[PDB]
Amino acid sequence: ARVAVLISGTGSNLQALIDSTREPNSSAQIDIVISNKAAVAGLDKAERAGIPTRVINHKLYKNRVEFDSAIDLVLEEFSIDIVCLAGFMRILSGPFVQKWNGKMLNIHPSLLPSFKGSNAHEQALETGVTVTGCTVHFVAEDVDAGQIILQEAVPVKRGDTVATLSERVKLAEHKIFPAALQLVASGTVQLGENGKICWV
Ligand SMILES: Nc1nc2[nH]c(CCCc3cc(C(=O)N[C@@H](CCC(=O)O)C(=O)O)cs3)cc2c(=O)[nH]1
Ligand SMILES: NCC(=O)N[C@@H]1O[C@H](COP(=O)([O-])[O-])[C@@H](O)[C@H]1O
């Protein structure tokens, strides 16, 4: 299966996916990396790995649908089968999500359904949980509400900050995102016709 990875920043999740998809038994190949932001470290990581990159600046588009259309054009250019959102921070439009239904995965740094949104660690710390984690899910129109593929729990230590908690949770993200991508790319896991996860 042919994979696009969408990023907005550092790209540690991208790097873990590069490493995993290059293992001999990988059912996935990363063929394009798309950032909505110029000059982020994730682009350097892609270039170092010899993977093509595109920058599609959302600020240059009148609305989400036009921006998503520009992304979709590149996905078609590279005959992409599966999209991974890896630190990509834009909400995607309904029609784009529908087109890619069952083919698009996101990593989120909480145990969904807790702490949806862009500041999950801030929320986890404010709430005072002692266990947080990360989630890979299929992307549905409602943000962070699509079907869960894998999760991993991560402890919150007393005195944690976003810096220390995010660091600990990223170690888990780097395990479950490659594992989830392999499950979907191999056809082991799919989004069922009933909209529920199906393990074949
Ligand atoms: N339809 C849909 N889109 C998705 N995009 C992402 C991946 C991103 C999930 C998130 C983005 C934001 C958000 O508020 N984005 C802002 C910009 C934030 C920023 O400037 O950094 C926006 O898009 O206007 C909060 S969580 C997941 C996901 C999903 O499940 N469904
Ligand atoms: N709303 C999605 C979200 O918060 N994504 C989170 O952004 C970070 C990106 O790190 P990376 O650029 O090093 O992969 C990761 O923690 C990812 O789960």
Side-chain angles (χ1 to χ4, degrees), residues 1-61 63-192 194-200:
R2 297 176 60 80
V3 179
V5 182
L6 274 51
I7 64 170
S8 300
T10 300
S12 71
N13 274 287
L14 169 61
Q15 185 65 53
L17 292 172
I18 292 172
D19 296 343
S20 69
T21 58
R22 289 186 162 172
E23 293 290 330
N25 292 340
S26 177
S27 294
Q29 56 172 301
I30 299 168
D31 298 306
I32 186 67
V33 169
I34 301 175
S35 179
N36 65 305
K37 291 187 173 183
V40 297
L43 292 169
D44 301 332
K45 293 178 177 62
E47 292 171 11
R48 181 177 181 171
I51 301 169
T53 60
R54 299 289 170 79
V55 173
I56 306 177
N57 189 353
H58 64 272
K59 298 179 180 176
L60 304 176
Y61 295 88
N63 54 45
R64 290 189 194 276
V65 162
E66 296 300 318
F67 166 68
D68 292 355
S69 180
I71 296 176
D72 197 49
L73 189 67
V74 176
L75 300 181
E76 291 293 324
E77 175 186 356
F78 286 85
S79 297
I80 296 304
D81 300 304
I82 295 171
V83 177
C84 291
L85 310 185
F88 184 74
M89 290 309 305
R90 305 300 294 176
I91 297 172
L92 295 163
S93 69
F96 181 85
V97 170
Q98 183 47 52
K99 174 170 174 169
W100 289 95
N101 188 56
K103 306 178 183 179
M104 181 160 53
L105 288 65
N106 181 59
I107 182 76
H108 181 81
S110 73
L111 293 174
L112 291 172
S114 290
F115 312 132
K116 298 176 176 178
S118 61
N119 63 336
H121 298 304
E122 289 188 347
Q123 295 180 55
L125 293 167
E126 174 59 27
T127 295
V129 297
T130 64
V131 173
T132 188
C134 53
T135 302
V136 180
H137 61 96
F138 284 110
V139 173
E141 179 162 2
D142 288 336
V143 175
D144 295 340
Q147 286 285 285
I148 291 168
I149 301 165
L150 295 176
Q151 298 181 293
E152 181 174 335
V154 175
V156 179
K157 294 185 163 187
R158 301 185 285 288
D160 264 344
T161 64
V162 168
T164 60
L165 184 57
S166 66
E167 178 177 63
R168 198 182 305 108
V169 171
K170 278 181 185 190
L171 297 177
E173 294 182 41
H174 301 163
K175 296 175 187 181
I176 65 166
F177 204 4
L181 175 58
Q182 175 61 25
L183 289 169
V184 176
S186 65
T188 301
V189 163
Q190 70 179 58
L191 190 55
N194 70 337
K196 298 304 188 63
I197 205 93
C198 176
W199 285 72
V200 313

